[PDB]
Coordinates of C-alpha atoms in Angstrom, one line a residue:
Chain A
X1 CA -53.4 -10.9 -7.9
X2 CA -52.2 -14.2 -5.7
X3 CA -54.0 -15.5 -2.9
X4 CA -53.3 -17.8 -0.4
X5 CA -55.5 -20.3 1.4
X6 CA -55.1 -20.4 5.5
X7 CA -53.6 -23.5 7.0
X8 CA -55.8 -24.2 10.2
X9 CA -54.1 -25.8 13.4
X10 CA -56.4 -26.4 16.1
X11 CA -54.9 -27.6 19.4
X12 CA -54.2 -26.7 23.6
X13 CA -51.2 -24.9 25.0
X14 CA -50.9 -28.1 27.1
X15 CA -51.8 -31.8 26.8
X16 CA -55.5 -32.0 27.6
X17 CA -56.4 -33.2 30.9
X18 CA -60.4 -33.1 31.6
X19 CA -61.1 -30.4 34.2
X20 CA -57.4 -29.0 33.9
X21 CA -57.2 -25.2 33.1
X22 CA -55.4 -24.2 29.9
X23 CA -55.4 -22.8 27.0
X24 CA -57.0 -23.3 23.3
X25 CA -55.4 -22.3 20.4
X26 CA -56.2 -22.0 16.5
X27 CA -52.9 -21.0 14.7
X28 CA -53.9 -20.1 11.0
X29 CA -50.7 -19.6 8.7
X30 CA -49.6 -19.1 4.9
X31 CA -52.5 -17.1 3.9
X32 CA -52.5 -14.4 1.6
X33 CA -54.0 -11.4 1.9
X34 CA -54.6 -10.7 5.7
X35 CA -57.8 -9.9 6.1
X36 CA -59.3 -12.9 8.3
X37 CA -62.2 -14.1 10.2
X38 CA -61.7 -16.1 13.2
X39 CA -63.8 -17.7 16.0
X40 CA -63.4 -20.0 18.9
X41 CA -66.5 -22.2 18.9
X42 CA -68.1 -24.0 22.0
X43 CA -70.0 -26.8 21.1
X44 CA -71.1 -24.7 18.0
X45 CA -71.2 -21.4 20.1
X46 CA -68.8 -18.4 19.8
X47 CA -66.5 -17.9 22.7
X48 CA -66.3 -14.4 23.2
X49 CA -63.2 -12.6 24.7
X50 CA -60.8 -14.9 22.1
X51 CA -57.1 -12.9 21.8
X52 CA -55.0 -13.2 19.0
X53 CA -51.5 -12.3 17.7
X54 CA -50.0 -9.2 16.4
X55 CA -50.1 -9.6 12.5
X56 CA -46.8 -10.9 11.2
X57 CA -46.1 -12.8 8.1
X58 CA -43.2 -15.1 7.2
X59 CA -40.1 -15.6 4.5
X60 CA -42.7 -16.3 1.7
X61 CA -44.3 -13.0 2.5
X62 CA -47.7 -15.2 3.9
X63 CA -49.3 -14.1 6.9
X64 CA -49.9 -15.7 10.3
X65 CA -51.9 -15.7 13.4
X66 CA -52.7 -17.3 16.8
X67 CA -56.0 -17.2 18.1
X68 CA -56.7 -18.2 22.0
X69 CA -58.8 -18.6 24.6
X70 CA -58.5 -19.9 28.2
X71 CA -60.5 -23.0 28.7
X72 CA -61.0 -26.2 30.7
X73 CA -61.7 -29.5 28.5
X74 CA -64.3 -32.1 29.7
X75 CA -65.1 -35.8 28.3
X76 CA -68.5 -34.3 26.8
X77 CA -67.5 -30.4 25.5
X78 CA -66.5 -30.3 22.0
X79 CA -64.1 -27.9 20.9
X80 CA -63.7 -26.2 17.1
X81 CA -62.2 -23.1 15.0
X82 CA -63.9 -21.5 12.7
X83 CA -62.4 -19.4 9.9
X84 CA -63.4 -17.2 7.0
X85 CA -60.9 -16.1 4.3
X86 CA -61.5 -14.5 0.5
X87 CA -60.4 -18.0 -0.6
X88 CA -63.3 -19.8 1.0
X89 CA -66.2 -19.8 -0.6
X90 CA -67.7 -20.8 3.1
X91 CA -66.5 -21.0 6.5
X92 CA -63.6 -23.7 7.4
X93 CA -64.4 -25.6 10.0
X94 CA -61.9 -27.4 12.0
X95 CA -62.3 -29.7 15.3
X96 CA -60.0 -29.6 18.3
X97 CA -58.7 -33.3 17.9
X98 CA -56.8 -33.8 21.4
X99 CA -54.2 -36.4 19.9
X100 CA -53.2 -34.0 17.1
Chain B
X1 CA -34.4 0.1 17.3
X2 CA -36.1 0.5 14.2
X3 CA -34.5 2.5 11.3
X4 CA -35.7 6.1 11.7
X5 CA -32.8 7.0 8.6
X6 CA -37.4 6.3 7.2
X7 CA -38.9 8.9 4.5
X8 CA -37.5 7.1 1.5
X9 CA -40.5 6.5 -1.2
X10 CA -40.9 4.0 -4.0
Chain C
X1 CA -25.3 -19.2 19.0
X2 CA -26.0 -15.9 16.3
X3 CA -28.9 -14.2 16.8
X4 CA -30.8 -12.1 14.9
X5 CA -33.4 -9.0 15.2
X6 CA -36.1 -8.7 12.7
X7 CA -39.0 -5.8 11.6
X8 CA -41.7 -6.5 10.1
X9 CA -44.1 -3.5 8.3
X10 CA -47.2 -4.4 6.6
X11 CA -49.5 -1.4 4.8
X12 CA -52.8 -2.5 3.8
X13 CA -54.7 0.0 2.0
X14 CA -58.4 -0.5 1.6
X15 CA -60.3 2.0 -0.6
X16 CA -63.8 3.5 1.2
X17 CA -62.6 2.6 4.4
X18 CA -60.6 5.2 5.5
X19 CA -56.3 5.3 5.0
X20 CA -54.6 2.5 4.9
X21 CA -53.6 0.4 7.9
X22 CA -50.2 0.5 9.3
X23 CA -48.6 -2.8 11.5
X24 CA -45.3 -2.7 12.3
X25 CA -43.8 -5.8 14.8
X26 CA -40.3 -6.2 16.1
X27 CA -38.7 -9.6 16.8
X28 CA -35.3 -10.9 18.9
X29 CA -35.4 -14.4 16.9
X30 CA -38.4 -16.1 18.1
X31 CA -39.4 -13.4 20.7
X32 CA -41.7 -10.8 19.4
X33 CA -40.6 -7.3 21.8
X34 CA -42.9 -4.5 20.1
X35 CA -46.0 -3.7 17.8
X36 CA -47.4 -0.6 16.3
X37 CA -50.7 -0.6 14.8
X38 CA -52.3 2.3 13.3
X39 CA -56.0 1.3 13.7
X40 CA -55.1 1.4 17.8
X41 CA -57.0 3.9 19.6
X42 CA -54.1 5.5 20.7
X43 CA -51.6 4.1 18.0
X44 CA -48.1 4.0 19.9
X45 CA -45.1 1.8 20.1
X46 CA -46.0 -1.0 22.6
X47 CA -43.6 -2.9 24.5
X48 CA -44.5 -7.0 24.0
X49 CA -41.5 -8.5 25.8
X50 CA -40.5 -8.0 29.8
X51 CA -37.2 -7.1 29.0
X52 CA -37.9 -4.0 26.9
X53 CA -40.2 -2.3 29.4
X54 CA -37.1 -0.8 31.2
X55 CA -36.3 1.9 28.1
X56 CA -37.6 5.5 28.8
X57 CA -39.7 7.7 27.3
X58 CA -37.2 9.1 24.8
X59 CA -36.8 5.7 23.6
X60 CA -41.0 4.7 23.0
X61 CA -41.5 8.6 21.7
X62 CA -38.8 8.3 19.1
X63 CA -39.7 5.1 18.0
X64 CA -43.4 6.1 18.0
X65 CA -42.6 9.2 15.4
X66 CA -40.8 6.5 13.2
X67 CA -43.7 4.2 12.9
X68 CA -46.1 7.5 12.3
X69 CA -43.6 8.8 10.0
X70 CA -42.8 5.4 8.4
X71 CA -47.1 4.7 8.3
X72 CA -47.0 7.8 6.2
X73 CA -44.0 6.7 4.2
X74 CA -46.3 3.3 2.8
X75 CA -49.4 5.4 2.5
X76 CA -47.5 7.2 -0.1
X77 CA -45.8 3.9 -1.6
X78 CA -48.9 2.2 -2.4
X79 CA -50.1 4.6 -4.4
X80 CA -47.2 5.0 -6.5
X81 CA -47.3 1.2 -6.6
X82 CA -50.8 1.8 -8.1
X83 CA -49.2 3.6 -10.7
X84 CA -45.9 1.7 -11.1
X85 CA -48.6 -1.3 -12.0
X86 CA -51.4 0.6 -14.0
X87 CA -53.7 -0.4 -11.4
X88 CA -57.3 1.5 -10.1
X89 CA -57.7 3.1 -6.6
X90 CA -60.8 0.9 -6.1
X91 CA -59.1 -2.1 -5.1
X92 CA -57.6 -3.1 -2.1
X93 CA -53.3 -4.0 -2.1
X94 CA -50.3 -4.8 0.2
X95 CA -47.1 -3.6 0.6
X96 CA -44.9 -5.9 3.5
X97 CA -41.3 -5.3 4.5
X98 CA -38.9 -6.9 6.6
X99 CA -35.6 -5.9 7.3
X100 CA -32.9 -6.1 10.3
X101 CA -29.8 -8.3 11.5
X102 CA -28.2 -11.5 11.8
X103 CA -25.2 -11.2 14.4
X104 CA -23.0 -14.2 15.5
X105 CA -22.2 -15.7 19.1
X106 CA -19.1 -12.5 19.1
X107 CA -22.1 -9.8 18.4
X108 CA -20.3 -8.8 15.3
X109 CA -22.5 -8.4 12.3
X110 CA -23.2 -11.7 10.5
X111 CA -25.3 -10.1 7.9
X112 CA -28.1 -7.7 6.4
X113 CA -32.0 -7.3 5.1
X114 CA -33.5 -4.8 3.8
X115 CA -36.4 -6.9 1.1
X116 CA -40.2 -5.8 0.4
X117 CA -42.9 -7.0 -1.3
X118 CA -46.0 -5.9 -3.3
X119 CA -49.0 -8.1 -2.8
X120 CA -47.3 -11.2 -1.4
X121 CA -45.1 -11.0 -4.2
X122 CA -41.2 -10.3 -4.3
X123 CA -40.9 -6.7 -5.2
X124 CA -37.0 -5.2 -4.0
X125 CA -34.7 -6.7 -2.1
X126 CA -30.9 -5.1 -0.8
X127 CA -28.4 -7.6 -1.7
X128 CA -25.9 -9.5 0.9
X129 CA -23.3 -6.6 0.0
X130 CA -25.7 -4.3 1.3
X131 CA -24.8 -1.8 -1.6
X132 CA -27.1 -3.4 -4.2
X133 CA -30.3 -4.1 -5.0
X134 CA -32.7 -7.1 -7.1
X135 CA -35.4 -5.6 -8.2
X136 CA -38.2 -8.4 -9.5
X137 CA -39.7 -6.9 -12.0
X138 CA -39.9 -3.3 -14.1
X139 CA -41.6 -1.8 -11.4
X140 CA -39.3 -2.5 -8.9
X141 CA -36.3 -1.3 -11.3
X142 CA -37.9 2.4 -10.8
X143 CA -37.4 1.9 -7.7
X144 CA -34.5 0.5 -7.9
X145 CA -33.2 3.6 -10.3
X146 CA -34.4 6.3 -7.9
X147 CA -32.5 4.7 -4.9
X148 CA -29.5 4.5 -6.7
X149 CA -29.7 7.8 -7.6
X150 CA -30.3 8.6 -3.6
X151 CA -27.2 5.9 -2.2
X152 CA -30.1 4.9 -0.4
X153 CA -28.6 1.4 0.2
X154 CA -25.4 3.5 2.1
X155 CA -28.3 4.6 4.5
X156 CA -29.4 1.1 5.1
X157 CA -26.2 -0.1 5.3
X158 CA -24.8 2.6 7.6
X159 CA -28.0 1.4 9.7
X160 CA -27.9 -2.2 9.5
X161 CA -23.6 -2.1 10.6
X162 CA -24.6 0.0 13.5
X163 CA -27.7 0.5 15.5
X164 CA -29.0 -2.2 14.5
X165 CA -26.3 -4.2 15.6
X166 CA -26.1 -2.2 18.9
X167 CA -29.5 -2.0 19.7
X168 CA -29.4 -6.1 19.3
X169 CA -26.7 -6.7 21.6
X170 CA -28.3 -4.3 24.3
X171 CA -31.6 -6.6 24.1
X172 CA -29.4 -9.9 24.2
X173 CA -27.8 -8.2 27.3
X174 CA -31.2 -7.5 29.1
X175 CA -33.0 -10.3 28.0
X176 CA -30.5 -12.8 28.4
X177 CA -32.1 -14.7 31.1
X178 CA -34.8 -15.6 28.1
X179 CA -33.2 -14.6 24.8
X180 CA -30.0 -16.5 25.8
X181 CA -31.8 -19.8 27.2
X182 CA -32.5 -22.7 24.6
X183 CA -35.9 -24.9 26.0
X184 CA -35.1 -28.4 24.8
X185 CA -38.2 -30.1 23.5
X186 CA -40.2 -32.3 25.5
X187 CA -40.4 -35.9 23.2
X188 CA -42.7 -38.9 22.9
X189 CA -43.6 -41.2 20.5
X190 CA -47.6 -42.3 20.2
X191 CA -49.3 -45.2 18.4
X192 CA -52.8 -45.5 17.3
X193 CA -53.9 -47.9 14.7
X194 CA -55.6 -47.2 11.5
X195 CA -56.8 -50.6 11.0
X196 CA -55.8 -54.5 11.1
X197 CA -52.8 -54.0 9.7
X198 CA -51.1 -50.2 9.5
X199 CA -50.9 -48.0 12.3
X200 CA -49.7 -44.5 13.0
X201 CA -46.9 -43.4 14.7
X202 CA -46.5 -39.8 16.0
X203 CA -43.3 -38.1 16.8
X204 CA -44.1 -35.2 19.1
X205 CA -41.9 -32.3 20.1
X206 CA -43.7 -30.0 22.5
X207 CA -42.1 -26.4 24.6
X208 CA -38.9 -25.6 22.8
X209 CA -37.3 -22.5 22.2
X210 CA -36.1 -21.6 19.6
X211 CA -38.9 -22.5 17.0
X212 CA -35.7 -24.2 14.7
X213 CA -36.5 -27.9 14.7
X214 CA -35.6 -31.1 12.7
X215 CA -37.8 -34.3 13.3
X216 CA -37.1 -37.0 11.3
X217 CA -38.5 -40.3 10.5
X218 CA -36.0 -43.5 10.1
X219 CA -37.0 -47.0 9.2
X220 CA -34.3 -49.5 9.1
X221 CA -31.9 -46.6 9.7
X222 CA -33.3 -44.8 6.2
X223 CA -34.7 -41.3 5.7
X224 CA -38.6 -42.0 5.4
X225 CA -38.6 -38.0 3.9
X226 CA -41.4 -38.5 1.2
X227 CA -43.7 -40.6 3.5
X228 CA -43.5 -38.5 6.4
X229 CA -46.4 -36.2 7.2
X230 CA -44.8 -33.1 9.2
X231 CA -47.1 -30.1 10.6
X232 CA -46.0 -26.5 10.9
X233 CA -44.0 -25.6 13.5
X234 CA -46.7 -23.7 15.7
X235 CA -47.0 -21.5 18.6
X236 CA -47.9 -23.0 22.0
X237 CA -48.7 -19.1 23.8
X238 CA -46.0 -19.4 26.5
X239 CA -42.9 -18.0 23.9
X240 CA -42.5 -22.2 23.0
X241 CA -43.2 -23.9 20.3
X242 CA -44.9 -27.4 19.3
X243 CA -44.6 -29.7 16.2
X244 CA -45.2 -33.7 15.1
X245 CA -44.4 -35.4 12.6
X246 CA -46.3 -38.9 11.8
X247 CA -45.7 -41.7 9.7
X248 CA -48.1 -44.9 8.6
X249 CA -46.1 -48.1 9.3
X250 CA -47.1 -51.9 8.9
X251 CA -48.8 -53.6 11.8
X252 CA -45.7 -55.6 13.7
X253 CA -42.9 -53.4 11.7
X254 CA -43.1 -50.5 14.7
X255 CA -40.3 -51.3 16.4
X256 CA -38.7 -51.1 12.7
X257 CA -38.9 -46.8 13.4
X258 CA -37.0 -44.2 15.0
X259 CA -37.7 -40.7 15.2
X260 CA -34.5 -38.6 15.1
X261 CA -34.8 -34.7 17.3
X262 CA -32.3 -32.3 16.7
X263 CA -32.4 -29.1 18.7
X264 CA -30.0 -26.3 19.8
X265 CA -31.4 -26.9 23.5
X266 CA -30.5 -31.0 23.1
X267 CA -26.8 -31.2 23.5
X268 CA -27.1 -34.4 21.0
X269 CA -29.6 -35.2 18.7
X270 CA -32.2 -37.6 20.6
X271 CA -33.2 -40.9 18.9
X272 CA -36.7 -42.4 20.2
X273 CA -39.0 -45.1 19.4
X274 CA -42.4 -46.5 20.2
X275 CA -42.6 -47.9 23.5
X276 CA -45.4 -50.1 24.2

């Protein structure tokens, strides 16, 4: 059969200001079939208690998902999402870039 | 309100 | 404007690991209102919207039997798909449908869906008349056989012209104060240089609602469409939306740009540039 590599978007609910509360997110999209491994990392460190989406998929039949977890940036914390699909022969990692 | 008119199969 | 309501089933079957998993969603455009997911502890129809809370117990049992009964339905369904396709029980498939209506700004029915696919592929779809079907391959034409046989599409369509409609214009009605309001995106334009002599410019659009977006990149007035990097329209977590699109420009040729916004919450498409 088709499958379909995850697009990764790693960003914050709001512009990033350093000791402001908000909200990280890790929206992976167009991915085909749905089983999918997801973490928040912490300067490499799992965040546990991460929420995500309901399971929906779009026109082209690919799946998507938002991943999240409450958080308050700093100048020194680094931020990341890592995902695991069929199509990856390793772990995608991505890094929170704050201007993108 | 989802369509309950469902037991149709392939 | 129009408006539409949308549900989304996805069967998953997965052989040595029990039956296979049912998730069913429900969205008012952009607004996702319910979910059903078989693997739940106790697998009910949840509300996921403030606006649908207020509907009794009649309404959350009955459509609690459908998704049960429909979970069922696509149980059965991929595993005549296993046979429509000559394929073994060992490995793992995916049936997804979507189906509902598109109504305009009167609430009369704009139009129809009813289309599903086997293994992110195209499988049967009911066409715009919503008394036909496409079927994408031999497979599907079974299918598509035994359903004309059954005037199932009269069912649909008998569905789709009424409730459906109904049931739309009852959740436009309660959740007007959020289904009816248009956010206009927030916009700004950011520079940050690549080297000595290109730079990029960013055009950002950040909490609008609906997702439906156009951002556009101009130079000297022209269409910059095959240079212009553009990002997925993506989910901020508070029902709005986000989405940039960037574009690498000549050192001194900046002001040379303009980033066109359209949106149904702008009552004119905005024009912006760089502002140093």
């Amino acid at each position: 059969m088709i499958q379909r590599t995850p697009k990764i978007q790693v960003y914050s609910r709001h512009p990033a200001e350093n000791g402001k509360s908000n909200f990280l997110n890790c929206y992976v999209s167009g991915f085909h079939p749905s089983d999918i491994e997801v973490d928040l990392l912490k300067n490499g460190e799992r965040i546990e208690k991460v929420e995500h989406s309901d399971l929906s998929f779009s026109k082209d039949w690919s799946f998507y998902l938002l991943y999240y977890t409450e958080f308050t940036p700093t100048e020194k914390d680094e931020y990341a999402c890592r995902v695991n699909h069929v199509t990856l022969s390793q772990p995608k990692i991505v890094k929170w870039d704050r201007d993108m | 309100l989802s369509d309950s008119t469902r037991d149709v199969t392939w | 404007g129009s408006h539409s309501m949308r549900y989304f089933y996805t069967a998953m079957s997965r052989p040595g690991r029990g039956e296979p998993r049912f998730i069913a969603v429900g969205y008012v455009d952009d607004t996702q209102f319910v979910r059903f997911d078989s693997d739940a502890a106790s697998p009910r129809m949840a509300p996921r919207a403030p606006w649908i809370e207020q509907e009794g117990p009649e309404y959350w049992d009955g459509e609690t039997r459908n998704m049960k009964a429909s979970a069922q339905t696509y149980r059965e369904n991929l595993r005549i798909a296993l046979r429509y396709y000559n394929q073994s029980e060992a490995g793992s498939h995916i049936i997804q449908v979507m189906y509902g209506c598109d109504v305009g700004p009167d609430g009369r029915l704009l139009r129809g869906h009813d289309q599903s696919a086997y293994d992110g592929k195209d499988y049967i779809a009911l066409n715009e008349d919503l008394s036909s079907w496409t079927a994408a391959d031999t497979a599907a034409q079974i299918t598509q056989r035994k359903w004309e046989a059954a005037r199932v599409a009269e069912q649909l369509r008998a569905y789709l012209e009424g409730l459906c409609v109904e049931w739309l214009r009852r959740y436009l009605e309660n959740g007007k104060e959020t289904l009816q309001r248009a956010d206009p995106p927030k916009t700004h334009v950011t520079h940050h240089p690549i080297s000595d002599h290109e730079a990029t410019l960013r055009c950002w659009a950040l909490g609008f609602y609906p997702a439906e977006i156009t951002l556009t990149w101009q130079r000297d007035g022209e269409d910059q469409t095959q240079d212009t990097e553009l990002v997925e329209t993506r989910p901020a977590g508070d029902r709005t939306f986000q989405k940039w699109a960037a574009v690498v420009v000549p050192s001194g040729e900046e002001q040379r740009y303009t980033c066109h916004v359209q949106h149904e919450g702008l009552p004119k498409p905005l024009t912006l540039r760089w502002e140093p």
